[PDB]
Design a protein around this nucleic acid. Structure first.
Ligand code: HEM
Ligand SMILES: CC(=O)N[C@@H]1[C@@H](O)[C@H](O)[C@@H](CO)O[C@H]1O
Ligand SMILES: *[C@@H]1O[C@H](CO)[C@@H](O)[C@H](O)[C@H]1NC(C)=O
Lengths: 108, 80, 371, 94, 95, 100, 96, 79, 94
DNA sequence: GTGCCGAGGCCGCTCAATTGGTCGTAGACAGCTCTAGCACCGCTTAAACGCACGTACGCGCTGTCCCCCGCGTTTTAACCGCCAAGGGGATTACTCCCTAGTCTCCAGGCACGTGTCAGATATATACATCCGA
DNA sequence: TCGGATGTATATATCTGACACGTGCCTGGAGACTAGGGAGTAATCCCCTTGGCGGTTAAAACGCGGGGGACAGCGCGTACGTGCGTTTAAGCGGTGCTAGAGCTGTCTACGACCAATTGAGCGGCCTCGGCAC
């Protein structure tokens, strides 16, 4: 028997292809699941996670902190138009709100 | 038990301040309390239905998260 | 039986000096530096062949047009093809998905309030490609095997050597070597090879030249600001001490060497700071170089009125026909090659793992160009 | 004790790939796990609906690609699509 | 010394938009949640996480509603928000 | 306006010279010189830049850029295609003439 | 002659009682084809698809105009203004 | 082709009258046209994606119905 | 010339039960069929989600009842539940 | 008043529901554990609760003016009815990759335990800002 | 329009608790192999979509007049922000109890899975009156 190597390593990913395949099979989504669907889903999930984590890390570095907190995630999500559209109807706990004030209320 | 008065006027004022409101009228507080009561009633009723279907007696965080998702207010941070 | 670049006549030829026995002066093209290596000459000849083939096809399709209209149409299609290939394959592999999304959003329309001129810093920040030079030139036969004689040629002997493309089997082995050889990965302790650093233009010049030293000297001559000023320009944090520099570069030994050289981050040259920063995820440049390059290319795209995606420039059917173009298709349709790599040719470098017989890929449909 | 599967180690590996010198708290980890689960569920549901519409009983990479194009907005989707292909082709090579 | 009206309001606006804590006391909200749930089932137990999630959702909803109400009030060439603004925002949102 | 001009002029209505050939570059930041006007750093010996001596470029490339050739690591995701297209695009973009 | 506001009320009463479409079919079909030309070329449209698009667009516009009327009445006005449309769209979450 | 102008001023006036609007300013026709164009662009893009996935060149009514439904705008009477 | 199943005969039977002397047009039939399909899909999807939440592999009467209680608003839901219960009871009797 | 096209009632099939066993696994019990939700008390003390001033803002009351509505006329294109082509949705069959289903093994990923270093908390300081003269 | 008072960001200790590893193990993923039904190509078939023409006329355009809302300006009076002093439970700890959520084990009965049968519903066909003129 040849030495076992994970499918994620074959596709050069970090997310688990096998776990995603099991979730697709047991999730009652369709009668049959193709062999390439888990790879596509894992790649998409890894890309989205990398994007949001990069933005959050940039925010944390700009805040002179070396750890990511939900405030940084909220700032990263709200400051990006595409991510804001994707998560328009999602509430992030301990996120706060984006700092803005209407120009009418400011004194002259 | 009149606990709807537990949402004090300073708390509603702080919530409005976070929203960017500069001046607040005196009649806002009662309307805010009514709106909060309606929202809580809906969410808690859905959560209690979810709990009762499971034949449990404790309202877990998963039930609240599922109810919020049903209303269209997906909440990140509790459960999955 | 395939066209080559026309020769050039100059008062002094530092390019004939490489081989006195051959007596073959190098070529003439749209740029005077088109004969630095046989690869550049091969690329220019391939572009010329593509232009000639497109002109012939357009003349065959429509005979009513004159020669000037044929030349202008072929030039327009070639420019659109170059823009498409660049902005669809090259930049995403340089900047990376995050930088590409941040600095190159979806095209909307032409903007007349943006500057399309080339910035002075871009003449140095774009020299990152000097860190991707392999020490040897590879030529392969029809079977992608090491082709004799000289399967691998030292780079110090291929500079300004046009005789190696006219009298050494043409450009097909050069294209095969380009398409089936991994590049050089840029590491913090491995910046650039010694062939370009100690044996640059060895035959042409009396003594060799140092390419990184030339880069720093040219950056100083142009009076470009230091590393810290450019870091602050793009919004990145500015290091001040040795520890901050080490944190920014994610390396301590290199930061210590930089501090012992300059003494302050503000005195660090732009090129060294750009090529010393850790590479982005799925990218080949640091955050500062990515910022500069993305800004420059966004300015170039937005400020170009003849952009291929701009309205009026092309018809919808023409746009659909152009959107299916690819570099491997052109490299197959203009030379004697018979095996090319898959899509995103800049990524495929292993034979025959990701090589196709290039008989199933679609061709360029010019049926929408009828008048 | 019953094991609880979660997207904890993979998110940390991705973060180390992107930011080698930055940690992440427990609340942020939970938020990331919830986000991954939500996106997975959305894409899988869209793919299932697409498969059902065309009277087909198999989820393939084409269904996932179309679901990604439908759900993810703008440039994001395009990039994601590329990544998907960039994986599947590689999985075919091995 | 006394600041002119509207200055401390702007200072509070700037202060509360930088923090991420909860602006409602925990015990009164827990009591309110328990009283509301008493009308559906008798002798119901609550996890702390459930009450925290309810508090977070309620605070986010109220903040969004107050933002919309401020927009409505500004639209009418006013600075003070009134119950009519809240009613209009809720009607437009579909509630 | 039907076709592009070889010299690139007239491309922008507000400024026809914008983006043309044989024109000056664009300085995103003010240039720095030892005298402040036209003298590149390192021309006059004994000058100090930002309170520090001006390091020699050749030495900087000599003891930092240099590395043993035997430890070259090939790129597993890129090829010479990358570098060749980069050089071609750069030759398309810009060129700085210099005195002979 | 009729004073202003009478014919408008008559039209409001008439159009709120009928169910017919209020946009000409051929111009709407041409606009739909023009818009779809961007995503794909040489597309064919069923008549039912165009009818469904027209019905959905008319319903959406009517609802938007109702919300705009509410916004205008809130500001103590009778005349619809673009700022009312913008406010309604922002509150509903479309342009937000 | 400027067929966006095919939606005439009387048509927008009729649409506003159906909504209960009494008085209409003359600067809102362009805003209504832009809003309609945006909505149509979104719906038609989704419908064309649905059609393309099915390997067809005809945009059926079912594709438009699905595109409307996926945006929370379910339409009854076409399947 | 293929079979296309629809809720056409059953809607007509219900209408004849309610209004024996009132007809129905084709557009109204299409609207009723679409409404029935939409409500069926909503209830079935909610029941499936409820079954998945509790780690159950079977959709039973309890899941449908809870889905009806969650989805249908107000006294309507209550009335619906009653009808369903009665039906089940009858189906148990015979 | 008036015809006509659409809703309604009848035959012919044929492709699902239904009746009748089989079986193996999902779920319903009973037991037992032990985690956490409830309750109770004492102490700060930070928050909330009244009270008085006055200043800025919400709110009516004129005024005018210009812009939108209402109407008449010439003009334009939607609309209905009709013909002819042909692209391309729908079916059919015929396999051929492709995927579900089963042992068997292992490593990847859970839980449990630990130590140290980001980070929240005082404290004085140096700015940054506001109302006033 | 320069000077006083206050609010706040910042640099310097200081303790802490939770996060990033380290280790054990067990179960779910990978490797093979076999079997069968999903669907990918081809080959027709007709249908319904696009294109074009002609006459009618109804709706879209345009210009003119006037009057009625929109917006600006001006009191005014009141009520809400801002401090300031006085209650008041909120939060933090420590403690103790037991309610019920979770896990283990067994068994049994109920829904999936077979096949033969037949009739319910769908398609095509007339047929007469409800209603848009
Ligand atoms: C592969 C081998 C290459 C060699 C041997 C080479 C050599 C040179 C030399 C000698 C110069 C003129 C003086 C100097 O800049 O040092 C130059 C100019 C330049 N090169 Fe390279 N080059 C190479 C590839 C590249 C690549 C791949 C890029 C970009 C992707 C690049 C970017 C530039 C730029 C921007 C200039 C302009 C400098 C100026 O105008 O002063 N070069 N090159
Ligand atoms: C050392 C050197 O350059 N030798 C060249 C040789 O390679 C080439 O074959 C010959 C004819 O061109 O000219 C000479
Ligand atoms: C053109 O660019 C300028 C400068 O960035 C920007 O303000 C403007 O909005 C742009 N215009 C368009 C039409 O995109």
């Amino acid at each position: 028997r040849a030495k076992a190597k994970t499918r994620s390593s074959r596709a050069g990913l970090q997310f688990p292809v096998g776990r995603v395949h099991r979730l697709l099979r047991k999730g009652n989504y369709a009668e049959r699941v193709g062999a390439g669907a888990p790879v596509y889903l894992a790649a998409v999930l890894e890309y989205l996670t990398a994007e949001i984590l990069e933005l959050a890390g940039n925010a944390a570095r700009d805040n002179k902190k070396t750890r990511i907190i939900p405030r940084h995630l909220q700032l990263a999500v709200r400051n990006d138009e595409e991510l804001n559209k994707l998560l328009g109807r999602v509430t992030i706990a301990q996120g706060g709100v984006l700092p803005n004030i209407q120009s009418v209320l400011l004194p002259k | 038990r009149d606990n709807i008065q537990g949402i004090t006027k300073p708390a509603i004022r702080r919530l409005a301040r976070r929203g960017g409101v500069k001046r607040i009228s005196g009649l806002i507080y009662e309307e805010t309390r009514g709106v909060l009561k309606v929202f809580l009633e809906n969410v808690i009723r859905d959560a209690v239905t979810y709990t009762e279907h499971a034949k449990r007696k404790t309202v877990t965080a998963m039930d609240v998260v599922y109810a919020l998702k049903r209303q269209g207010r997906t909440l990140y941070g509790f459960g999955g | 039986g395939r066209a080559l670049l026309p020769f050039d006549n100059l008062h002094d030829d530092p390019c004939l000096l490489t081989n006195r026995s051959a007596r073959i002066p190098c070529f003439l093209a749209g740029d005077t530096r088109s004969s630095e290596m046989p690869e550049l000459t091969s690329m220019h000849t391939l572009l010329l062949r593509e232009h000639n083939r497109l002109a012939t096809e357009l003349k065959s399709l429509n005979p009513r047009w004159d020669g000037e209209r044929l030349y202008q149409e072929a030039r327009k299609i070639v420019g659109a093809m170059v823009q498409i290939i660049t902005y669809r394959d090259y930049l995403p592999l340089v900047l990376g998905p995050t930088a590409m999304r941040k600095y190159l959003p979806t095209y909307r329309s032409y903007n007349d309030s943006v500057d399309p001129r080339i910035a002075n810093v871009f003449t140095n920040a774009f020299r990152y490609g000097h860190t991707l030079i392999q020490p040897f030139m590879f030529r392969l036969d029809n079977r992608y095997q090491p082709m004799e004689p000289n399967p691998r040629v030292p780079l110090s002997r291929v500079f300004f050597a046009s005789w190696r493309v006219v009298l050494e089997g043409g450009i097909d082995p050069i294209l095969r070597g380009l398409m089936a050889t991994p590049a050089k990965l840029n590491r913090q302790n491995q910046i650039a090879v010694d062939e370009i650093r100690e044996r640059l233009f060895e035959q042409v010049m009396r003594i060799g030249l140092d390419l990184p030293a030339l880069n720093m000297q040219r950056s100083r001559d142009h009076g470009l600001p230091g590393y810290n000023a450019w870091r602050r320009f793009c919004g990145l944090p500015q290091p001040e001490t040795v520890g901050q520099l080490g944190t920014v570069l994610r390396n301590l030994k290199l930061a210590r060497k930089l501090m012992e050289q300059y003494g302050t981050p503000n005195n660090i040259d732009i090129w060294m700071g750009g090529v010393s920063e850790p590479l982005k995820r799925k990218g080949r440049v640091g955050p500062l170089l990515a910022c500069i390059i993305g800004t420059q290319f966004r300015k170039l795209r937005d400020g170009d009125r003849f952009w291929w995606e701009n309205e009026g420039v092309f018809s919808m059917q023409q746009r659909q026909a152009l959107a299916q173009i690819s570099l491997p298709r052109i490299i197959c349709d203009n030379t004697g090659i018979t095996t090319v790599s898959k899509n995103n040719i800049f990524m495929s470098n292993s034979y025959p793992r990701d090589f196709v017989n290039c008989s199933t890929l679609p061709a360029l449909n010019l049926a929408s160009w009828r008048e | 004790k019953t094991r609880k599967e979660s997207y904890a180690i993979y998110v940390y590996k991705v973060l180390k790939q992107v930011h080698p010198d930055t940690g992440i708290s427990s609340k942020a980890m939970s938020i990331m796990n919830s986000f991954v689960n939500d996106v997975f569920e959305r894409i899988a549901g869209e793919a299932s609906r697409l498969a059902h519409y065309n009277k087909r009983s198999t989820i393939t990479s084409r269904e996932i690609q179309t679901a990604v194009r439908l759900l993810l907005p703008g440039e994001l989707a395009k990039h994601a699509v590329s990544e998907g292909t960039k994986a599947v082709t590689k999985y075919t090579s091995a | 010394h006394r600041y002119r009206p509207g200055t401390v309001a702007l200072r509070e606006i700037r202060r509360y938009q930088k923090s991420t804590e909860l602006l409602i006391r925990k015990l009164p909200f827990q009591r309110l949640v328990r009283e509301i749930a008493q009308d559906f089932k008798t002798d119901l137990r609550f996890q702390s996480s459930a009450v925290m999630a309810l508090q977070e959702a309620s605070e986010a909803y109220l903040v969004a509603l107050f933002e919309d109400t401020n927009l409505c009030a500004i639209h009418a060439k006013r600075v003070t928000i009134m119950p009519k603004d809240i009613q209009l925002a809720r009607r437009i949102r579909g509630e | 306006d039907k076709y592009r001009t070889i010299t690139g002029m007239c491309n922008n209505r507000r400024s026809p010279t914008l983006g043309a050939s044989n024109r000056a570059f664009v300085r995103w930041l003010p240039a720095e010189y030892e005298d402040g006007f036209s003298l590149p750093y390192g021309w006059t010996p004994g000058v100090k830049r930002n309170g520090f001596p001006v390091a020699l470029a050749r030495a900087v490339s000599n003891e930092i850029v240099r590395f043993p050739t035997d430890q070259l690591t090939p790129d597993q995701e890129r090829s010479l295609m990358f570098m060749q297209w980069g050089q071609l695009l750069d030759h398309d973009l810009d060129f700085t003439p210099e005195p002979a």
